[PDB]
Amino acid sequence: DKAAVERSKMIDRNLREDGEKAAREVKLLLLGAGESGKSTIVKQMKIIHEAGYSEEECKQYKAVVYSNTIQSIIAIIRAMGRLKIDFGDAARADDARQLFVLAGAAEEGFMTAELAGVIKRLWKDSGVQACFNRSREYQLNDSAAYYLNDLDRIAQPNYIPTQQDVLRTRVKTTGIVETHFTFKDLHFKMFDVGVTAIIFCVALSDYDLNRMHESMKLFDSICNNKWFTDTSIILFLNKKDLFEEKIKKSPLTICYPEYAGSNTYEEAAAYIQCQFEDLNKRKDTKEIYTHFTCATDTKNVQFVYDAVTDVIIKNNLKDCGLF
Numbered sequence: 001d002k003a004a005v006e007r008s009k010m011i012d013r014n015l016r017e018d019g020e021k022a023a024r025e026v027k028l029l030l031l032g033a034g035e036s037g038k039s040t041i042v043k044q045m046k047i048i049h050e051a052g053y054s055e056e057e058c059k060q061y062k063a064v065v066y067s068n069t070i071q072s073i074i075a076i077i078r079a080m081g082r083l084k085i086d087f088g089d090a091a092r093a094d095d096a097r098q099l100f101v102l103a104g105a106a107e108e109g110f111m112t113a114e115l116a117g118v119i120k121r122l123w124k125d126s127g128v129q130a131c132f133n134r135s136r137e138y139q140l141n142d143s144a145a146y147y148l149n150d151l152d153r154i155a156q157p158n159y160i161p162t163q164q165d166v167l168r169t170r171v172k173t174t175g176i177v178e179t180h181f182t183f184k185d186l187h188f189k190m191f192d193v194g195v196t197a198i199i200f201c202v203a204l205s206d207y208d209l210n211r212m213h214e215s216m217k218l219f220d221s222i223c224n225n226k227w228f229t230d231t232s233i234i235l236f237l238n239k240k241d242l243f244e245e246k247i248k249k250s251p252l253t254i255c256y257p258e259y260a261g262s263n264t265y266e267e268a269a270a271y272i273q274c275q276f277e278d279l280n281k282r283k284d285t286k287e288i289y290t291h292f293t294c295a296t297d298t299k300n301v302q303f304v305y306d307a308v309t310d311v312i313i314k315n316n317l318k319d320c321g322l323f
């Protein structure tokens with residue numbers, strides 16, 4: 001292990017009376033466009049490094065799960081009208097109406113056998129499925145399929161959200177979120193918006209929604225900024241799972257008209273990676289550390305973060321103070 005050898009070369013703890021107990025601090029900036037996966041990464045840090053989410057904590061997210069699900073089905077049904085897409089079985093029009101009656105009379109997210117029934121039949125309808133598959137034409141939660149396909153479990157009277165259910169939530173976050181965790185004896189200070197490292201998140205599946213080019217313009221700015229010269233810049237190309245499902249049927253050319261590679265996961269994901277890394281104007285001075293992630297996948301984030309941490313250890317320790 002080169003990172004272990006590297007950190008063992010430090011001597012600054014010896015300048016402190018109780019140096020071996022001192023906390024080495026790493027400030028990490030979590031950046032990226034809305035819905036790029038920043039909150040999800042923060043949640044994985046709690047899960048992997050700080051003992052996860054207990055059941056009682058998971059119960060607090062129940063009505064958020066309900067709310068996300070309701071939002072999803074409504075967005076699809078409403079889009080059917082704008083896109084002129086007919087129901088398969090014409091009796092679903094009553095279920096569509098009933099969905100609005102129930103959502104319209106309620107205080108917040110909820111679930112009943114009646115609502116579950118309405119939504120199940122809607123999600124199973126061929127016309128609804130056809131509208132769902134044109135989601136790129138409107139605005140729809142990426143977890144729409146996840147919750148809807150599992151509606152039966154979510155709908156049970158004694159339903160308790162799983163960690164995956166909580167990770168899959170979209171929560172309206174405002175302002176700056178700061179989280180703290182210890183890993184490999186490093187005391188991380190992570191800021192979801194002069195720093196040790198930046199993690200920049202990109203939603204790969206946004207390519208056909210222009211979102212990707214806005215993500216690029218933002219990365220161009222950040223990557224090449226003055227304050228970040230000695231900052232380790234990490235690129236998370238996220239939602240690789242949604243990208244892989246989607247790249248089979250929707251072409252990269254929608255985002256990058258000049259693209260002439262095959263429309264496969266391997267070629268299209270590589271191309272995207274190059275588009276972002278090429279935005280680095282100091283190529284011989286700064287390296288970009290790129291990882292393809294699925295932020296909802298605890299194992300993948302654990303692995304990826306372990307590698308991101310070895311890079312910080314080999315590269316940035318000298319600028320990390322003791323406290």
Ligand SMILES: Nc1nc2c(ncn2[C@@H]2O[C@H](COP(=O)(O)OP(=O)(O)O)[C@@H](O)[C@H]2O)c(=O)[nH]1
Binds near residue numbers: 036037038238
């Ligand atoms: N399938 C999938 N969903 C993801 C991934 N990353 C984030 N999400 C979901 O995308 C939505 C937005 O993510 P979020 O962390 O809130 O983005 P933020 O605005 O940058 O904080 C949430 O519902 C997440 O559950 C991913 O890699 N794969």
Ligand SMILES: O=S([O-])[O-]
Binds near residue numbers: 007008013024185
């Ligand atoms: O001294 S290093 O191991 O934080």
Ligand SMILES: [Cl-]
Binds near residue numbers: 035141143170
């Ligand atoms: Cl989303």
